[PDB]
Amino acid sequence: SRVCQVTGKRPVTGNNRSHALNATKRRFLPNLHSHRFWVESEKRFVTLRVSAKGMRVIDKKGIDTVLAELRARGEKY
């Protein structure tokens, strides 16, 4: 799936609006990238499918803080 693991962003739907305002269904795809992270507590390459914003959340909280949040709400990595 294309669900972000850190933030939880799911693809939602939108509409094409042209000059004549004709509606056409489309979807909002996040900017997901598989980025590899080295942790200090476990000393292991931890790969995660994160968004472009979800990488910035790791920059503030820390890689050890996010993995404690993934343990609390049930997701695995």
Binding site: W38, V39, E40, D59
Partner: protein, 50 residues
């Protein structure tokens, strides 16, 4: 960001100071594999006496 260097980093070298740096060079070179530390006011106070 405001990471503080530890080891003998080359030019932009500080030997321990708050300098500005891009985010791509902070993570994966200066954060892990070392030679720096984040500045979340818990690490820089514990490494103040170092």
């Amino acid at each position: 960001m405001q990471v503080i260097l530890l080891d003998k980093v080359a030019n932009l070298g500080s030997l321990g100071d708050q300098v500005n740096v891009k985010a791509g060079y902070a993570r994966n070179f200066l954060v892990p594999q070392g030679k720096a530390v984040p500045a979340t006011k818990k690490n820089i106070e514990f490494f103040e006496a170092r």
